[PDB]
């Protein structure tokens, strides 16, 4: 999850299986023009 210049971007990935040792990439899936102030999440 990233939020820059008033835009909210969400990248995601799924896979089958402490975190495992391996290499994988993530693809862009959401961009929204929210444009608010975000400091804490749940």
């Amino acid at each position: 999850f990233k939020n820059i210049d008033g835009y909210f971007k969400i990248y995601s990935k799924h896979t089958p299986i402490d975190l495992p040792q391996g290499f994988s990439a993530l693809e862009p899936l959401v961009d929204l023009p929210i444009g608010i102030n975000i400091t804490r999440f749940q």
Partner: protein, 48 residues
């Protein structure tokens, strides 16, 4: 692009219009492409 034009005959009333409001006080400067709609009074002193 930025476009500006005149709307005198569409937003002027003899008795005066007060539907349009602006903000004058804030604690910190505004981030680009940001919208705030708060109403809390500007804390200039200690007592709320």
């Amino acid at each position: 692009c930025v476009i500006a034009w005149n709307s005198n005959k569409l937003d002027s009333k003899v008795s005066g219009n007060y539907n349009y409001l602006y903000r004058l006080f804030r604690k910190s400067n505004l981030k680009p492409f940001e919208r705030d709609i708060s109403t809390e009074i500007y804390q200039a002193g200690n007592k709320p």
